[PDB]
Amino acid sequence: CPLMVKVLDAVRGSPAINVAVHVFRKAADDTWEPFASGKTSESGELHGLTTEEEFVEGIYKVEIDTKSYWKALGISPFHEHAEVVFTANDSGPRRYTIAALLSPYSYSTTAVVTN
Amino acid sequence: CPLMVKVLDAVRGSPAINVAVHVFRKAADDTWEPFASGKTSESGELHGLTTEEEFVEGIYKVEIDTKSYWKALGISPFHEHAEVVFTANDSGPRRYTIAALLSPYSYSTTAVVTN
Amino acid sequence: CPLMVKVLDAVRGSPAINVAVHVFRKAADDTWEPFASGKTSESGELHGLTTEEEFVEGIYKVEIDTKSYWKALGISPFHEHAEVVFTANDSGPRRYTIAALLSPYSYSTTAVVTN
Amino acid sequence: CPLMVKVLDAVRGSPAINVAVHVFRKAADDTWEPFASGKTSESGELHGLTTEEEFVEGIYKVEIDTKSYWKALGISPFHEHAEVVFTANDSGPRRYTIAALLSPYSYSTTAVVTN
Ligand SMILES: COc1cc(CCl)ccc1Oc1ccc(Cl)cc1Cl
Numbered sequence: 001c002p003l004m005v006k007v008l009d010a011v012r013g014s015p016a017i018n019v020a021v022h023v024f025r026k027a028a029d030d031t032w033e034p035f036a037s038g039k040t041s042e043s044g045e046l047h048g049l050t051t052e053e054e055f056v057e058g059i060y061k062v063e064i065d066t067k068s069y070w071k072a073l074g075i076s077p078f079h080e081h082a083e084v085v086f087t088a089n090d091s092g093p094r095r096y097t098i099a100a101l102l103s104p105y106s107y108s109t110t111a112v113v114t115n
Numbered sequence: 116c117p118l119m120v121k122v123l124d125a126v127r128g129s130p131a132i133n134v135a136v137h138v139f140r141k142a143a144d145d146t147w148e149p150f151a152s153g154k155t156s157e158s159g160e161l162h163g164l165t166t167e168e169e170f171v172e173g174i175y176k177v178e179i180d181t182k183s184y185w186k187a188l189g190i191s192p193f194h195e196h197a198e199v200v201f202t203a204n205d206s207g208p209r210r211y212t213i214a215a216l217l218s219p220y221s222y223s224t225t226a227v228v229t230n
Numbered sequence: 231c232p233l234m235v236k237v238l239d240a241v242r243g244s245p246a247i248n249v250a251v252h253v254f255r256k257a258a259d260d261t262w263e264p265f266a267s268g269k270t271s272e273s274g275e276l277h278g279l280t281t282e283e284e285f286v287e288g289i290y291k292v293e294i295d296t297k298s299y300w301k302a303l304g305i306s307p308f309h310e311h312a313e314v315v316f317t318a319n320d321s322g323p324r325r326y327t328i329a330a331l332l333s334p335y336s337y338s339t340t341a342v343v344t345n
Numbered sequence: 346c347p348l349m350v351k352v353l354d355a356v357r358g359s360p361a362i363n364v365a366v367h368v369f370r371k372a373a374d375d376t377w378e379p380f381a382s383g384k385t386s387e388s389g390e391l392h393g394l395t396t397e398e399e400f401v402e403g404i405y406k407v408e409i410d411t412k413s414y415w416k417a418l419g420i421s422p423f424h425e426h427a428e429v430v431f432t433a434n435d436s437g438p439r440r441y442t443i444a445a446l447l448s449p450y451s452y453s454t455t456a457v458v459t460n
């Protein structure tokens with residue numbers, strides 16, 4: 001698994017479950033082309049988005065649908081989503097974990113990159 | 116000044132000075148149109164982006180050029196930039212501060228909505 | 231004012247108002263002796279804790295009563311408080327801002343050391 | 346495993362490896378009595394600190410030795426340590442993951458609590 005996404009809820013102290021996540025890759029023509037998408041599991045993890053063959057060099061954007069998450073929970077949050085944008089595989093394949101911690105008016109995001 | 120941006124550097128424990136910030140408003144065709152931009156000051160703050168009469172309800176994107184900031188310091192960074200996307204909602208008089216705390220592989224952002 | 235504390239609320243997207251903050255200095259026998267304290271203001275800020283002549287090098291603990299803050303809002307919190315422990319080092323003229331961003335089950339803190 | 350600690354490095358985008366962690370429990374007499382201690386593994390995780398029999402109700406403090414971590418890496422950080430203090434098992438046994446994300450002048454910490 002070259003790309004994994006982990007999301008936690010800082011209000012509840014729990015995994016953020018059933019969060020939609022869409023991944024895009026910047027195309028030749030500068031557009032954001034759809035790449036893969038999925039939903040976080042009961043452990044707040046999203047696996048199986050892609051494969052080492054598919055996950056080529058490029059600029060990727062991982063958009064986490066934090067607004068739908070808070071709304072499903074009856075809360076009106078500030079951000080539309082949380083998007084993480086990075087160049088991947090510049091020096092060869094790496095494994096990327098994108099972790100996000102969500103509050104209604106705040107989020108943070110970190111990347112763990114291993115070889 | 117209904118919209119201010121403040122950026123701090125978690126590695127040096129200082130304001131993040133001279134960071135480029137571009138603000139876009141979502142247009143009816145779903146493209147992002149330039150709205151306002153500037154460089155943060157010596158105090159990591161960016162004032163005077165817009166006025167109340169110009170700043171109407173809508174979806175806005177604040178893009179912070181974290182990549183250039185880290186490179187100008189000789190530090191290798193993960194993210195291409197940091198994008199903060201939110202709906203400006205008239206519910207009240209409504210000053211928005213978008214604050215961001217930067218690390219090479221991580222950032223956080225919070226909104227402080229007052230008055 | 232060589233030492234200031236600023237606290238924000240990530241759930242409401244506001245300053246954290248009226249939060250109790252106690253500052254201790256580590257004594258030679260390793261106990262924490264009271265040094266300064268106060269409640270954050272309407273802007274989530276706490277000024278006037280100490281003066282340059284009183285604030286000597288040493289280890290200081292800043293304890294932020296996050297538990298009372300959440301309870302006064304009717305929100306269930308995880309941490310008993312937030313403690314920020316650091317060495318004040320004369321290397322330069324040296325204003326310290328200790329900033330904290332609070333969630334029910336999470337907080338972050340950053341130091342901004344300027345001048 | 347009732348108590349686990351996970352630490353990440355936000356500068357490198359990696360697990361924070363070989364971080365010392367000491368756990369204390371507030372005694373009858375209001376003192377912090379040593380409870381368990383360990384070091385994070387190659388994955389930045391610390392397992393096996395305690396058992397469901399040992400990990401009784403109480404107020405616990407998990408002190409993460411972030412200063413030694415940065416120093417080993419040739420860096421002079423701001424904080425002495427990062428301490429997390431919480432009441433555990435008030436409504437019966439729970440499993441607690443204390444996660445911390447470290448930068449030289451900043452850290453955040455979150456708790457994931459599951460039943
Ligand atoms: C950077 O975002 C922040 C993150 C955290 C959690 Cl560490 C607390 C406060 C923050 O915002 C500020 C921090 C310092 C100053 Cl001087 C001003 C502001 Cl608005």
Ligand SMILES: COc1cc(CCl)ccc1Oc1ccc(Cl)cc1Cl
Pocket residue numbers: 006008097099100101108109110336351353442444445446453454455457
């Ligand atoms: C933004 O994500 C994180 C933020 C912080 C700062 Cl408190 C710490 C860890 C984070 O990522 C995780 C948090 C908990 C688990 Cl179990 C796993 C991961 Cl990868």
